[PDB]
Symmetry: D2
Subunit: 424 residues, 4 copies
């Protein structure tokens, strides 16, 4: 079986609780997190985190997405930062146990319409192959359409994460989310635009609505602010990181903590440590039931397979859900049900591998082997790639159970199969 020690780790006594109150009462500081950290860390790259050597330390500390703030620097400066990130990422393309795809996100300066500088900076993003755009001061659905249009003919695969920074953005949230790929709760400007004591209501509301819609939500700004000058954060700061994860955030961000502060690597390490602890403390019993009850009935086989797979993973305490995905959509639909099992996404798309870091609990594996002549053989080779990487990284052991999600024919949009596999 698994043993009594297995059921004492990763807050499993608190997870089995019949009420939220009992769940809180059963939280144990001695119950150690075992699962890999599922909340992605976005680190803002600036003078303090630009060097190739510093970026290697940040990748090792847990950075998944590199943010380039186009409110500062120049095109030449950000292109050098992008090249340094790509160089530090590719320095691990040898050791499979260390290679990790890192997304590149462009944060716009902001706006009567889209600013001239935004148009130029967005074009720069397309030309430099950025994966994500954090669009500043989004107030309505037409602002997202303008950013979408500026991403031109070559950039329609770039993800647009709309930053909600003012009262109008909060009030028009539903129409913005409908046309955006995700949302960033941009607390800095939001805390100036609306009373500071109301920001938590906007954060909790937007995270809840994004979780319900199955779209990524980023919690941003001043999460570990004091770490710009101090080697350890305050009690309010560690609490804030933990509570953003407990709220349901897919990503957490570092701004000045990594862009200009004295402790960029330590700030990433701190976010990693807190997120792991907070993910184990999530009350999955009620969360899954509520995501289940609130999500409408679906006749989309990818959505139907995803809920079946997450239910199966919870039933056997599956070590992982291995999904084959071209666009990342199959992994995103698994992620919306918040499984405790890691979602190992095997893809041939280098861009999808970087973009799936926006989805909580998705661990991308970029597959570069040449295709098999028989499609079913090519599928099994990718499933075994996910198992062998999982074994290598520590996610899996022989005798573990995994859930495998695939489709019935090649190409995106046909996911409809869930298999229960025993690791051999």
């Amino acid at each position: 079986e698994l043993g009594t020690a297995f059921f004492q780790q990763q807050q499993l006594p608190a997870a089995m609780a019949d009420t939220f109150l009992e769940h809180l009462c059963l939280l144990d500081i001695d119950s150690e997190p075992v699962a890999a950290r599922s909340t992605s860390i976005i680190a803002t790259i600036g003078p303090a985190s630009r060097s190739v050597e510093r970026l290697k330390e940040m990748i090792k500390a847990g950075m998944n997405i590199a943010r380039l703030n186009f409110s500062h620097g120049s095109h030449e400066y950000h292109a050098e930062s992008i090249a340094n990130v790509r160089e530090a990422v590719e320095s691990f393309a040898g050791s499979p146990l260390s290679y990790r795809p890192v997304a590149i996100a462009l944060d716009t300066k902001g706006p009567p319409g889209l600013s001239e500088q935004d148009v130029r900076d967005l074009r720069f993003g397309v030309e430099h192959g950025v994966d994500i755009v954090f669009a500043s001061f989004v107030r309505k659905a037409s602002d997202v359409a303008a950013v979408r249009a500026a991403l031109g003919p070559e950039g329609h695969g770039i993800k647009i994460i709309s930053k909600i920074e003012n009262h109008e953005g909060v009030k028009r949230f539903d129409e913005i989310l409908e046309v955006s790929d995700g949302i960033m709760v941009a607390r800095g400007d939001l805390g100036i635009e609306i009373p500071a004591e109301k920001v938590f209501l906007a954060q909790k509301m937007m995270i809840g609505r994004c979780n319900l819609a199955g779209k990524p939500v980023v919690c941003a700004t001043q999460m570990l602010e004091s770490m710009i000058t101090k080697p350890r954060p305050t009690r309010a700061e560690t609490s804030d990181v933990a509570n953003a994860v407990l709220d349901g955030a897919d990503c957490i961000m570092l701004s000045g903590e990594t862009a200009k502060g004295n402790f960029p690597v330590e700030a990433v390490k701190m976010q990693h440590a807190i997120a792991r602890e907070a993910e184990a403390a999530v009350y999955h019993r009620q969360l899954f039931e509520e995501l289940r009850r609130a999500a409408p009935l679906s006749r989309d086989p990818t959505e139907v397979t995803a809920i079946g797979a997450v239910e199966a993973a919870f039933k056997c305490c599956a070590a992982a859900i291995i999904v084959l995905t071209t666009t990342g959509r199959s992994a995103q639909l698994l992620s919306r049900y918040r499984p405790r099992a890691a979602v190992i996404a095997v893809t041939r798309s280098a861009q999808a591998a970087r973009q799936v870091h926006l989805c909580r609990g998705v661990f991308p594996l970029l597959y570069r082997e040449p295709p098999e002549a028989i499609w079913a053989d090519d599928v099994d080779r990718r499933v075994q790639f996910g198992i062998e990487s999982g074994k290598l990284r520590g996610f899996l052991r022989v005798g573990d159970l995994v859930i495998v999600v695939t489709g019935w024919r090649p190409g995106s949009g046909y996911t409809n199969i869930m298999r229960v596999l025993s690791i051999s």
Copy 2:
């Protein structure tokens, strides 16, 4: 469509509380799904005619009960043959053929402590005549079940033993009896004499609840439509009783004198069929599925893990059916324990398993007769297609429906591990 959400008590099924669920029950909401609670009809003078048995199979009879408290071995062998003859008269159309189980109900131990000598003889008769199930009378402890198992010998290992709880000791030792039995029968006639009559409903509801929790079949028996022995229509208490046995969670409902000796055997089967369909639509699945899920323990068995994943997927898309390939019936039983609204269409080559799965609510057995294909994957698809074709013929499926298909990774029993979402074309 908007009309779809009007039928099969779907407004009452979406209710957030049990009280609102009751308030939304609609007499104009027609049941659409196939009747999932099995009907056991006791065979007798009123129901041994081969032509009368054909009418009863068409009316909904799933299990033929042979009461060994009456008649000789020669009488019961003629009952078995008349049953098999009426069942096999429909084998010429394999897409509409209905398997019918044969159950032997023992006389019991009487003033005796354990397996009576007559029961030893009757049980061996059952093995020799290939009965599918034994309804073991007056089971009081786990050792009574072991004695019935021993009397069936090495050749009767596949026969299902349903322990009849008919007295206080059986109720008090219920847990140990259920652990070693394949299922339970709430034998209300003797139970109502052995314990105060006003307490039988507590024993019925408790045993049904515990069997549902254990995932084992439970039969509600005796006097369900008693007045239909002489009258063409039942009383208000009788229709209520049938509906409430289904709402309690019974897998099977039974007819005794109503089919064995009465004047309305076909109409008593039609009546149970009509009530069960209405009551199944009125089940509050929202709470029931949540509770069965929360109470079911964690499992490392791939059949069990696939079953809950498949039931969850079926609810998510309002799947018309869950088509499962099964050798012993176990994969269909594990689907059935989560009480899906979707019909569990079980495709099997075992004629015995096809008969025995009638004990599990919502399992519709299809007997596959074709010899195996050389390529195993093609043999699985042909059986899946046979389920789709049978389901289309029988009204379970239409083009455009979504179905969940449950299969395994290699031949033989015990390897179910795959769930597929399929669109009917």
Copy 3:
């Protein structure tokens, strides 16, 4: 276990093995069913009232005394049979048997008298019904079971036929056809309660659908806080046989589990060979079924569904029921003029008996329509100080409770009273320790 540990040490483990208390503490309905125990005996008094149809088998004063002792709470007179002279003799015999026990509170049982109308037959109120309803007013009947109610205007016609003198009579509309089921909400709004008349309903709609109509109407009446009666063929075989069938005992238990305030006996008591035994059987089943009710979910659902209220009687009633559940109160003693304060307690389905102390003989008979209400008729002349008249009535309920099994030394009771005399001013809840 932690929420019942101190109370288990105080009241004892035997207290918590009775009245299905292990099944009542269950966290799910499934676990609640699994914990039902045939050895867990009912302790509480029977709360679902029994309506017995009075006919040739149950008319004698001596037979009626046996039926009152067996548990009959409401005597039904079916105006589809007999004559005015026949039913007046039945009424007089019921009143004579009821008053033969008027010697003390520790032995008095008030019994309501209900008139069941013949019906309209082939649209408006029939001329026979106008005559029969006038008979009911003249003979002081407490309730009218109005046959074949199809719309709100049918109820208004019955109310009009009762005249100015029959304003206090309760109108229980009988739902017997498809139109009455479809127009249920408008009928319930203007009626005092409902009767699920399963005999005609089972002929008017498919017999296999009657259970849906019964469960729906009971649920809606529970939600509205109005009495609902389950009627017809509950113990049918007991007309000739001394014991009922397994379906019949199941039906009675399920009507109580559904949420019915009253259960009825028709030919079972009017013409059968075992009228007293039929009443005893319904009494035995109802007590067992009341203990098996899953109060944990039921109370939560009645609370969540009941709208917010600014009526102090309504606010006091929910507070009193909550307090009674918290301490396992033996009773909730309420002072009432019309029965309304006791009815508002009853709508939350407390496990504690609602002992209603009233001076109104009619209200004492009519509160039998509400599940768990035990009426006590107070006969003493008023005290000079109103506060001391209130205290005397509360003590009358505590004295009847003490020597009637209900209350014991060391028991907690919840007492519900008002701030001024007259109907409509209930607003006080007190926790009292009995000594």
Copy 4:
């Protein structure tokens, strides 16, 4: 509607989060008490008057700093600023005085001296530092002597042993303080939130006050506005179920002590309206054990009645504060207005969330029933003056059958004016 009522009616916690509205303004009075540490920046009588008006309910004196002479001057200045508002008895705000001990280090003689100072100066609460076991609480209780029988002991959990022995400490303490500063050094900083949420949950279950403390608005020591993490932290302590929130250096030595109190007040009001009462009340009620105590039985009946009619307040007559504490444990949305003649109980009841103490200084009526009705009308008049009540509102009134402590057993539904 206002006070997050659309989010409060939600059928799931997820839908409740989705319905939270920045435009839905808080209407109810702030229920989470603010403890402000008094030091050089908040010592002056004039500064203390502005802090009382900003929302300070409990004045904390940290015996890790200063001297007995210094803290006695602080106590006198607090009492002077509090009494400057006693001319209007319908608006007078009681303020508790809490002594925070230095601690044991490697019961110390320093602590024995400081605890006797507290008894001699009439302190209402002792924040007992570094509590590791039930015997540490007994030692603090012994040092308070026979004259300090009524002082509330709030045990500070600041290390691994305190967390592990939490249950035995809570059973003998009056309440708990989650002392996050030392706890964040004694255990990994990323685990403190688990200890905070667990201790708050267990105290809510036990019906005992819990204080969230340290670095809640830390940046406000030098800056006029807090960080986004800080406002989030205050809101989350209230959402966790904390009865009190604390300010240390923010009020003791910082440049913006009044602004820090105003900030905690503003956040707490917003966070209290965002509490999901539908699930919280049902969980507190299901988990609270069955009781034969009439005060306990009346308290749940009164909270249930208050929710049923959206009562503006629950007015309770209490001697020791116990009847108000038993109402508070069910977390009613209605303000618990506690009318008390004891000045000590009025100060100590600030430890319980949603309890608003009213000190009774009117002459006693000759008839006891008349005396009770006047204390009840006093609650109504103070409520009307302070904005808690309006004509037409419904209030729940909780009283006893006989004078003296321990006889609460009555709940009445009253319509205002």
